[PDB]
Paper text:
Jumonji domain-containing 7 (JMJD7) is a JmjC (3S)-lysyl-hydroxylase that catalyses the modification of Developmentally Regulated GTP Binding Proteins 1 and 2 (DRG1 and 2); JMJD7 has also been reported to have histone endopeptidase activity. Here we report biophysical and biochemical studies on JMJD7 from Drosophila melanogaster (dmJMJD7). Like hsJMJD7, dmJMJD7 forms a homodimer with each 316-amino-acid monomer possessing an N-terminal helix-loop-helix-fold domain (aa 1–42) that forms part of the dimerization interface, a core distorted double-stranded β-helix (DSBH, aa 160–294) fold comprising of eight parallel β-strands and an α-helical C-terminal domain (aa 296–310) which is also involved in dimerization. Notably, the crystallographic analyses on dmJMJD7 combined with previously reported crystal structures for hsJMJD720 reveal the unusual dimerization mode of JMJD7, which involves interactions between the N- and C-terminal regions of both dmJMJD7 monomers and is likely conserved in all animals making JMJD7.
We thus attempted to obtain structures of hsJMJD7 and dmJMJD7 with 2OG analogues and found that dmJMJD7 was particularly amenable to such studies. We obtained His6-dmJMJD7.Mn crystal structures in complex with the near isosteric 2OG analogue N-oxalylglycine (IC50 0.3 μM, as shown by a solid-phase extraction coupled to MS assays using DRG1 (aa 16–40) peptide substrate), N-oxalyl-D-alanine (IC50 4.14 μM), N-oxalyl-D-phenylalanine, and pyridine-2,4-dicarboxylate (2,4-PDCA, IC50 1.34 μM). The structures reveal that all four compounds bind at the dmJMJD7 2OG binding site by bidentate coordination of the metal ion trans to H175 and D177 and by interacting with the 2OG C5 carboxylate binding residues in a closely analogous bidentate manner to that observed for 2OG itself. Comparison of the dmJMJD7 crystal structures reveals a flexible region (aa 123–138) located N-terminal to the DSBH β-strands, which normally forms a loop around the dmJMJD7 active site and is likely involved in induced-fit during substrate binding. Compared to that observed in the dmJMJD7.Mn. OG/succinate/N-oxalylglycine/2,4-PDCA structures, this loop adopts a different conformation and forms a non-DSBH β-strand extending the major DSBH β-sheet in the N-oxalyl-D-alanine and N-oxalyl-D-phenylalanine complexes.
Author numbering:
A (entry chain B): 0 to 129, 134 to 312
B (entry chain A): 1 to 312
């Protein structure tokens, strides 16, 4: 038999199984109305993927070469890793850390050159925007009103991504509503619903950052507080691509959803959904992050965090 | 405190600090379907809209006009001695959950009994879609299309439409319904006390023998316990507290609860979201109608079932 907290958790999971909560990513051929989106997806905290939804100029024009021609081969901020796991788990001297990317700057064409070398380190570009007007002129952001009218606030962030196939984003959650638009290539998402939290292994790890030495080899440097001892972070311990079900029995009761998002597709990723992200080589994407509007679901989720701490 | 009580403390802290289910929103104008979906339905948040309806009914529906328009036909009426149909009452040392005495009588007969201050409490409260079922001719004095602003968020027709006409002594004890509720007062006013689902742990609940009101040959009311052949009580889980006069010594947990009071006048619309606890009083001969819609399941319902397991 099981504990009191575990009886409560089991009731949650059984009720959500019977009702098939978060059991499928809805597939749409056409952009829904603002009301359809509010009713069927936003208010139900439910992912949706809209196929061939966008006809943006970008979708054709945008490549690394065209971006170099357009942006004037500017200097950008790029994240670098030895293993391709920025914000991810890595071992050193037998200790598993949560490591942050080595963040540096370089010329866009140099980034492109370093993307074509399989032998080198893994690079990805994540630009946190709000030349740049020229780039914004290749996008019809109004096409996303159907979703924005549900959130009733402007994008709190608009990110541009250009990255290596080797760049894998490990499973994590975000306090945002997320509208994701692939421009070039395809992005693979693995999604787990919030309420399955108790089936997702999480641990506490010393946090570090990747650094190069004089010789150019990578190591992990522990991160430390204002003055004194180490810093920690809580992070998903399981690998969705190859779950070790022996080490993590409970993960077998989870139900991950797999969705591939192609150029011209839209993916609504609701707030606090677990996701793991892969992509094709030199995939380009832009996504819009909206601050969430707190409802009782968030409070239940905080409670669930407390129960499964 | 235990792990479960710690988790419940988290739930209540976050909800209180984020102003979740913390008030009834007043509007003077009917929202748009999108506004209603975003601000009230998707948030499971109650809202009252003042002077929202201009139905013919709001002018004309009285005891007399209903006696005339319905040809003084016979109707279902719930009767109690204390005014608590489907409520708790004590007898011979035992607290029972009591079902009302249900009978049929002429509409004019009911009106005569509402005019008796000393009589038993009468209430036309059958619900189970008694307006569409038993009173179709009244439907022409309403305009259900005016509720489209909310109906589009439910995306299904009303699964029930109820008609209420009761005594000021007829009080409905606190309970929850598996429905989205659109409440339209026609005459008089209705007083609601509301508590959000996530405060379930602040609401005491008990298992009670079930009974039903009966009269003796002399006309005295009494509770008859409901039992099967074996002599065993059939039980009902019910809210134990009286929102009007809470007994915080008996029920300390109700201290952390925050009831919301709202009076709904003729022409006002109240949206009572699914599984919201509600207690209902009314003015004398208040007339109301309301529309029940089956709820659309999401993870909140699973969390509420977990909350019920956590507090039993
Ligand atoms: O595209 C990504 O690599 C990525 C990484 C982390 N987060 C997100 C997101 O859409 O939230 C996307
Ligand atoms: O108006 C009432 O008396 C009443 C009683 C019980 N329930 C409801 C309801 O609208 O759910 C209304
Ligand atoms: Mn993310
Ligand atoms: Mn009710």
């Amino acid at each position: 038999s099981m504990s009191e907290v575990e009886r409560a958790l089991d009731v949650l999971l059984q009720e959500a199984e019977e009702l098939c909560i978060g059991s499928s990513v809805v597939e749409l051929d056409r952009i829904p109305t603002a009301l359809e989106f509010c009713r069927e997806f936003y208010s139900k905290n439910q992912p949706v993927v809209i196929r061939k939804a966008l006809n943006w100029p970008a979708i054709g024009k945008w490549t690394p070469k065209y971006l170099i021609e357009a942006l004037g081969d500017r200097s950008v901020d790029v994240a670098i890793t030895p293993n391709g796991y920025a914000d991810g788990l890595a071992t050193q001297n037998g200790q598993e850390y949560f490591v942050l990317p080595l963040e540096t700057k370089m010329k866009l064409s140099e980034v492109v050159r370093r993307l074509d070398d399989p032998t080198g380190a893994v690079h990805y570009i994540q630009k946190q925007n709000s030349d740049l007007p020229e780039l914004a002129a290749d996008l019809r952001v109004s096409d996303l009103d159907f979703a924005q009218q549900s959130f009733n606030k402007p994008p709190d962030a608009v990110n541009f991504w250009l990255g290596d196939e080797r760049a894998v984003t490990s499973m994590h959650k975000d306090p945002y509503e997320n509208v994701y638009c692939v421009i070039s290539g395809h992005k693979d998402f693995v999604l787990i619903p919030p309420h399955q939290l108790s089936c997702v292994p999480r641990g506490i790890y010393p946090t570090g950052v990747y650094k190069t030495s004089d010789s150019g080899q990578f190591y992990i440097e522990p991160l430390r507080d204002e003055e004194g001892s180490d810093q920690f972070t809580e992070w998903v311990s399981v690998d969705p691509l190859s779950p070790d079900l022996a080490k993590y029995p409970e993960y077998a009761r989870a139900k991950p959803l797999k969705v591939r998002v192609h150029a011209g597709d839209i993916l609504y990723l609701p707030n606090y959904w677990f996701h793991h992200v892969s992509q094709s080589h030199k995939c380009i994407a832009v996504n819009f992050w909206y601050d969430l509007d707190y409802d009782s679901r968030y409070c239940y989720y905080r409670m669930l965090e407390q129960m499964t701490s």
